């Protein structure tokens, strides 16, 4: 298969290169950690707010064409769940809210900052911290929206058997949603004493 | 006919909004003139204005017999 | 979305104007507004017409809607006005509450400075203006928490007319007080800090204008502890409401 | 300036906090998502044994409390104001990947024998107790990462 | 002059026009006519309110550099 | 050169402008092509359907307009000697309307392509699937939501 | 049109230390790299020095490039030039002058390209 | 003290964040690959044993 | 050389000029090959319908137009000392129009396949065929708009 | 060595020159395959029609001389002393007219296999096949227009 | 500080006591998962014989004792200034459990799956699945023995 030989490909360069370096000497030169030093910190803020959104949309919408399909199917002999079952779309749609407030929240860092603190402690420390945890809201976010989703479409499906199953399987989602909100308590704690950037 | 149902309420508006567009040119309302990029001589615009809106009231008029008949 | 038990508080008459209000809210502009208005007007009047022709339902909907569209506009229309916004431009009713200054050149920066209130809508200084979004974004989201929270809370209360119609004493001391004590304690409060903040004059007192919400942040996850005082005895009564709500 | 407090160690710090939660999220998704396919499933079929057979999903969802903990934790110790040293990072950077992965590998064990334990429960009604057992066994495998999230974030700040 | 006060100037005001109708509400429809006008003027009212606080003691003020001069 | 603006910062603002309308162009694509399809495979035997059907290829082409409208904003705000602050603003501007709006044409194609074969065999079925397609449609709002506050502090204040 | 002032000058013994300064209106000062250039008697213009419009990055002529430092305040519309170990060669009209946007690149400053310049002051030694 | 005088941090920069923006393309268009025709309801067949 | 010149300045023009045309011809390729083979599938049984038919192919075609206006315009703009900010500008045009074009490339090529199908069964839904391919072939539009605006500002006030 | 001429700049030129011909004849073999099954298949029983059935042949050939010239006319610029910039461009013309003669070949070889079965049974087809055919080899004829613009700007004012 | 202890020294320190958990929690949930479906598979049946079919689950458990026997001595050993000799050690430690252990899971994940399934159909069978896992267990406790050998040189004879 073609896409495992390029990933083969790409692994044994990669280690070639790096006993290249070794072996000769010069090993000091790969230097992840001057990397982290150099590159702008806006850089590192900028990719964990559109990828907070971003993801956490990925989330969103994955999660309510598999509820909806389902919805849809599951309707054409009982049309009464179309309107119960709004629910299930509802637990998905608000894990972009989610990333939408926390980009809300992080954008209101996004200052200049002086040329000569450009790479000073603390510019350094929000650069990283809105990264990881952009990243966190995002990523918890798609895995909660997915979560919620297939499970709305278990619910559905359900529903058009017997009413009285579906008050008993909610319980399975809103347990699924809970996943989105811890994601939120723990960006909000990660981007907590981030400053500024001065 | 059908129409000239489109063309006369789409006139209709043509004529109050071009020719109220136009007087706010013709007295250098800050909302149309003020900033350095809007275009310098308001009465210049707004006569060009007044004639698209005799335009579209020859439009209005002449389909209001096509929707009477 | 379904039939209501019987006896039960109708959800009709709230929705009778709650439910294009908070359209307008979202659709403000008063010559969209205008334009909605005409349409739905015009089947509104000619009504015993349509009444008796045959329609397909992607337009019997829009006239069994007819007064729905109607009120769905006139309120779009109020709503545009205090947004001051009709085509994307905006209304030079009032004098402004904001002077610039004496003089500048071509292509100088100004700022505005206060010299009263507008009376109604956003002042139309703020057209063009090159931090409008940062004012309006502020207006808004406040805007929207506070109907929000005004909305839900008075829909709440139709909970409290039910249990004393069916004289269901125990839903009265097992789900309402609870439910109510523990919503308007958090975001009841949130409510209160966000109309109490306009009332302060920071400037004129030389304060440090709080952040509402790090402050809400903090009282859950760092309670009895304060960056900025927005009033007396901040932290003394936020611990009391943490304790009300977790209890 | 220390040597050992670089200004890129807050980075490991972080990238450890995104790790615990991130991969524990995915360990309970897992968990219950399988387990909710089971429960649905025997739906049509014995409606009686739902409430009394969610007990998957209950477990699935403790072990987002196990991240949320160690993303807690580390998240306490980072700070703009202090020298956090590197040998910190590395150890936080532990502490993500140790309770991150060892409840991404016991959601999914939880989620295999869930699924298959309620939706042949419904045959035989004896099997239950034998289900929960094998859970539990499939439970502590996310707290033993915990264990060891705890002592790596004990000794990295001391 | 503006102040808090006049906000709650005109709830008074509102607040006894509508009471003052719930008492002279027509009889026919009177549920109809009781609900929607007193909720209208009340939700009017909060939209006018808060637009109007927002606007008292503003921390931000317009800020602008295409203005021409004479304006 | 400056420490602030480096000769390659505009490459963030070039490739945001044209990721913000790349990517909603391919969710728009996607969502007109799988809608599609299901308004064929239905009105071969029910075409009086058509016109009301068609909804799910109207909301897929509003996602484009989200495209377009930040697309052509952050292109606004372009020049040579930009700084590198604006730069990545104008990336995270793009970016996040751009992968918004992806994943929201694709639910959209999903979704309608369910929906317009339900509409087909059960008439009640339409309402539903309208209500459902709107909370596909609002995921690409929100990208460009925040694409409007990031690029609203393109220019603030940022010195060279 | 655009105006500036410069300030400071007189005659000064070898060894001084005078500090020119320069105010400015009529434009966004923050927007525009600034510049000073000097003409002793009877030669042509000389480029002294440039800053950026954040005042983070400068460039000094040889003649100068340790003696002279030029500073920039964005919110005072204002531009100084400190110098030190002043001597006769120094003796010239200075003049305060408006240049490119943002800041000068190579090709620029060699051009000698500027918009608008005041009516200098003098400087003898 | 630079980070490489060929591999510079700006040009990193611009690889990482173009990587990025071509993944997001790769799973765009490894999704749109998949979109098959509903072939048989497009086409009527017939035989004479129904109906 | 001149840090806002670098030799390497016109590599980006020149992969930008050939982006242009080299992606929108993929995407008209799929749409006149896809559609082609619903056209003679269904004008073996209906040939008098075959003049009617071909819509799609035009469609498909004119997308391949839209890359070659803007890949002629940037080309015009090259030169051996062009800014690296040009560079930028026509790299990001040509990535609009191109990657755009394809997007549009696919829908056109699948509606057009499925909807000259389905008009050989009913002919009702031709008119709705074309409705939807409008849609589609929009989705190009915008790729050039964001293309011309951002070739546009490609030279003004640049400084090389 | 020259700042504007790196002693490497002549591989841009050599990878351009082959490109352009390694490309086109891909495109150009897989159109003459896929439609020489077709033209094998779709005569056994109707051989009458054999050589008015080769024309997708013919014209999947054609597009291999647009390589062809494009080819040769770079083969002529090179020189060991060439400008950087004037490797780009001839890096630029051998893409533009090698990837989207690659396009219009597979478009041609899916047509034509599709249009050669049905114009066996259905003689009114041809003509369809002929003018669809047309669009698509037109695909190619973009590409070398594109190359041959560059061509001209390669080296008409550049200097070492 | 000393070039035999780089500060970067802990980090593959760290990384082999990760290494120790998350392989051995795979080895020891895969063989949890596939033996739990044999066991619920089976006692639909017999569901007299649970409690004694259920040993491999148990066997499986066990591997994820010595990942965390392994993992709590390395963390133990661990310190701001450790010689980097002392990490190599560490991740190999970490690395022979681990791995080690990842093998030991898939073996009683295949061997019970099957044994337990056996089993219900002939009780004699049972001793012989128990002699299987044993041989399968050992693997384990092979790379557990490797790895307290590498843990205790980790500091024998160091200096910083």
């Known amino acids: 298969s073609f896409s495992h030989f390029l990933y083969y490909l790409v692994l044994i360069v990669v280690i070639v290169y790096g006993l290249y370096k070794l072996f000769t000497g010069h090993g000091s030169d790969i230097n992840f950690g001057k990397f982290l030093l150099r590159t702008s910190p806006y850089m590192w803020a900028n990719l964990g707010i559109a990828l907070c959104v971003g993801l956490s949309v990925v989330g969103a919408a994955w999660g309510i064409f598999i509820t909806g399909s389902s919805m849809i199917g599951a309707g054409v002999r009982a049309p009464r769940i179309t309107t119960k079952n709004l629910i299930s779309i509802i637990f998905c749609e608000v894990v972009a809210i989610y990333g939408l407030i926390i980009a809300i929240v992080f954008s209101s860092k996004l200052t200049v900052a002086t040329a000569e603190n450009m790479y000073s402690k603390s510019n350094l420390y929000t650069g990283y911290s809105l990264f990881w945890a952009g990243i966190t809201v995002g990523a918890s976010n798609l895995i909660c929206g997915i979560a919620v989703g297939i499970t709305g479409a278990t619910a559905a499906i359900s529903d058009a058997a017997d009413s009285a199953l579906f008050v008993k399987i909610l319980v399975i989602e809103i347990f699924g949603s809970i996943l989105g909100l811890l994601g939120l308590i723990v960006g909000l704690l990660m981007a907590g004493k981030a400053s500024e950037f001065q | 006919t059908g129409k000239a149902w489109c063309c006369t309420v789409l006139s209709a508006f043509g004529v109050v909004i071009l020719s109220v567009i136009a007087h706010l040119f013709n007295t250098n309302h800050e909302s149309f003139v003020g900033s350095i990029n809007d275009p310098e001589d308001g009465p210049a615009v707004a006569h060009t204005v007044y004639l698209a809106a005799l335009v579209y009231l020859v439009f209005f008029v002449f389909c209001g017999f096509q929707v009477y008949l | 979305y379904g039939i209501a038990q019987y006896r039960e508080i109708n959800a009709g008459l709230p929705t009778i104007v709650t439910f294009p209000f908070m359209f307008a809210i979202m659709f403000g502009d008063m010559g969209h507004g205008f334009l909605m208005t005409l349409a739905a007007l015009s089947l509104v009047l000619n009504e015993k017409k349509i009444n008796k022709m045959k329609r397909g339902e992607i337009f019997d909907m829009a006239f069994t809607g007819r007064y729905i569209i109607l009120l769905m506009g006139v309120f779009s229309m109020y709503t545009g006005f205090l947004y001051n916004d009709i085509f994307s431009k905006t209304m030079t009713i009032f004098k402004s509450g904001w002077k610039w200054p004496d003089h500048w050149k071509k292509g100088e920066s100004i700022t505005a400075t206060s010299v009263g209130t507008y009376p109604i809508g956003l002042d139309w200084a703020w057209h063009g203006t090159e931090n409008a979004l940062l004012f309006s974004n502020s207006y808004k989201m406040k805007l929207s928490i506070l109907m929000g929270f005004i909305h839900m809370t008075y829909s709440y209360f139709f909970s409290l007319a039910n249990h004393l119609y069916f004289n269901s004493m125990i839903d009265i001391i097992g789900n309402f007080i609870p439910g109510l004590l523990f919503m308007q304690g958090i975001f009841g409060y949130l409510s209160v800090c966000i109309v109490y903040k306009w009332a302060v004059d920071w400037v004129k007192d030389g304060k440090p204008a709080p952040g509402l919400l790090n402050m809400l942040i903090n009282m859950f996850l760092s309670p009895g502890t304060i960056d900025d005082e927005l009033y007396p005895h901040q932290a003394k009564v936020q611990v009391f409401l943490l304790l009300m709500a977790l209890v | 300036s220390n040597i050992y407090a670089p200004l890129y160690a807050p980075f490991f710090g972080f990238a450890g906090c995104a790790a615990a939660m991130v991969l524990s999220c995915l360990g309970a998704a897992i968990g219950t998502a399988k387990s909710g396919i089971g429960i649905a499933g025997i739906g049509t079929f014995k409606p009686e044994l739902i409430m009394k057979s969610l007990i998957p999903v209950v477990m699935s969802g403790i072990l987002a409390i196990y991240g949320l903990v160690v993303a807690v934790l580390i998240a306490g110790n980072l700070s703009p104001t202090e020298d956090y040293t590197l040998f910190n990072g590395f150890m936080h950077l532990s502490c993500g990947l140790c309770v991150g992965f060892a409840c991404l590998s016991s959601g999914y064990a939880i989620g295999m024998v869930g699924d298959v334990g309620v939706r042949k429960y419904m045959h035989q009604p004896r099997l239950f107790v034998g289900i929960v057992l094998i859970l539990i066994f499939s439970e502590v495998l996310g707290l033993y990462g915990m264990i060891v999230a705890l002592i790596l974030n004990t000794r990295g700040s001391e | 002059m503006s102040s808090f006060y006049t906000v709650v100037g005109v709830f008074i005001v509102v607040s006894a026009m509508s009471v003052l109708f719930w008492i002279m509400a027509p009889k026919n429809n009177q549920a109809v006519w009781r609900s929607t006008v007193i909720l209208t003027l009340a939700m009017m009212f909060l939209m006018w309110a808060i637009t109007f606080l927002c606007q008292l003691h503003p921390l931000v003020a317009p800020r602008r550099s295409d203005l021409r001069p004479e304006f | 050169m400056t420490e602030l603006c480096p000769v390659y910062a505009p490459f963030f603002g070039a490739i945001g402008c044209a990721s913000a309308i790349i990517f909603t162009s391919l969710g728009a694509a996607y969502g007109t092509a799988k809608s599609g399809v299901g308004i064929c495979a239905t009105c071969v035997l029910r075409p009086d359907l058509l016109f009301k059907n068609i909804v799910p290829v109207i909301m897929a082409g509003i996602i484009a307009i989200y495209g377009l409208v930040v697309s052509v904003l952050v292109c606004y705000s372009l020049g040579q000697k930009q700084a590198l602050y604006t730069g990545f603003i104008q990336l995270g501007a793009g970016l996040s309307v751009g992968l918004s709006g992806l994943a929201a044409g694709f639910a959209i194609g999903i979704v309608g392509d369910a929906g317009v074969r339900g509409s087909s065999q059960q008439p009640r079925l339409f309402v539903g699937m309208i209500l459902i397609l709107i909370f596909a449609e609002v995921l690409g709002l929100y990208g460009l939501i925040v694409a409007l506050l990031l690029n609203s502090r393109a220019t603030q204040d940022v010195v060279c | 049109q655009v105006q500036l002032q410069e300030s400071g000058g007189g005659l000064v013994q070898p060894g001084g230390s005078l500090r020119l300064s320069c105010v400015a209106s009529?434009?966004?000062?923050?927007?525009?790299?600034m510049t000073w250039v000097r003409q002793a008697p009877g030669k042509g213009l000389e480029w002294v020095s440039d800053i950026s419009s954040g005042g983070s990055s400068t460039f000094y002529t040889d003649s100068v490039k340790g003696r002279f430092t030029i500073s920039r305040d964005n919110a005072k519309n204002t531009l100084y030039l400190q110098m030190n170990s002043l001597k006769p060669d120094d003796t010239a009209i200075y003049f305060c002058?408006?240049?490119?946007?943002?800041?000068?690149?190579?090709?620029?400053?060699?051009?000698?390209?500027?918009?608008?310049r005041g009516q200098g002051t003098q400087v003898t030694v | 003290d630079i980070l490489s005088s060929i591999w510079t941090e700006g040009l990193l920069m611009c690889l990482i964040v173009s990587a990025l923006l071509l993944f997001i393309l790769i799973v765009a268009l490894s999704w749109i690959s998949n979109l098959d025709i509903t072939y048989g309801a497009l086409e009527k067949s017939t035989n004479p044993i129904k109906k | 050389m001149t840090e806002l010149c670098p030799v390497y300045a016109p590599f980006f023009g020149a992969i930008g000029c050939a982006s242009a045309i080299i992606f929108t011809s993929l995407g008209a390729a799929y749409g006149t090959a896809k559609s082609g083979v619903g056209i003679c599938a269904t004008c073996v049984l209906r040939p008098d319908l075959l003049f009617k038919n071909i819509v799609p192919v035009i469609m498909a075609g004119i997308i391949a137009i839209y890359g070659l206006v803007v890949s002629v315009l940037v080309c015009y703009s090259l030169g051996q000392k062009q800014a690296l900010y040009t560079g930028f500008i026509q790299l990001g045009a040509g990535l609009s129009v191109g990657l755009s074009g394809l997007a549009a490339g696919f829908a056109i090529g699948i509606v057009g396949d499925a909807g000259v199908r389905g008009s050989s069964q009913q002919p009702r839904l031709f008119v709705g065929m074309i409705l939807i391919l409008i849609f589609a072939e929009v989705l190009g539009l915008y790729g050039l708009i964001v293309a011309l605006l951002l070739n546009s500002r490609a030279t003004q006030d640049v400084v090389c | 060595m020259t700042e504007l001429c790196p002693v490497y700049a002549p591989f841009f030129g050599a990878i351009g020159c082959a490109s352009a011909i390694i490309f086109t004849s891909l495109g150009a073999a897989y159109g003459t395959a896929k439609s020489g099954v077709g033209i094998c298949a779709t005569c056994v029983l109707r051989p009458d029609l054999l050589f008015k059935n080769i024309v997708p042949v013919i014209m999947a050939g054609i597009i291999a001389i647009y390589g062809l010239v494009v080819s040769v006319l770079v083969c002529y610029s090179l020189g060991q002393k060439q400008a950087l910039y004037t490797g780009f461009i001839q890096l630029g013309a051998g893409l533009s007219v090698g990837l989207s003669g690659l396009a219009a070949g597979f478009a041609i070889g899916i047509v034509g296999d599709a249009g050669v079965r049905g114009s066996s049974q259905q003689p009114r087809l041809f003509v369809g096949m002929i003018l669809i055919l047309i669009f698509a080899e037109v695909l190619g004829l973009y590409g070398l227009i594109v190359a041959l613009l560059l061509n001209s700007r390669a080296t008409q004012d550049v200097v070492c | 500080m000393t070039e035999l202890c780089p500060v970067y020294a802990p980090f593959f320190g760290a990384i082999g006591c990760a290494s120790a958990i998350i392989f051995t929690s795979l080895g020891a949930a895969y063989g949890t998962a596939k033996s739990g479906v044999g066991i619920c598979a089976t006692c639909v049946l017999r569901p007299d014989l649970l409690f004694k079919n259920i040993v491999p689950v148990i066997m499986a458990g066990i591997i994820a004792i010595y990942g965390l026997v392994v993992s709590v001595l390395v963390c133990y050993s661990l310190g701001q200034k450790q010689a980097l000799y002392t990490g190599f050690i560490q991740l190999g430690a970490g690395l022979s459990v681990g791995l080690s252990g990842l093998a030991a899971g898939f073996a009683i994940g295949i061997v019970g799956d099957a044994g337990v399934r056996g089993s219900s159909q002939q009780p004699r069978l049972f001793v012989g699945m128990i002699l299987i896992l044993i041989f399968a267990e050992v693997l384990g406790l092979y790379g557990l023995i490797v790895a307290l050998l590498l843990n205790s040189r980790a500091t024998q004879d160091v200096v910083c």
């Open positions: 009529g434009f966004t000062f923050s927007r525009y790299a």
């Open positions: 002058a408006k240049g490119v946007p943002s800041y000068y690149s190579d090709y620029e400053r060699r051009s000698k390209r500027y918009d608008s």
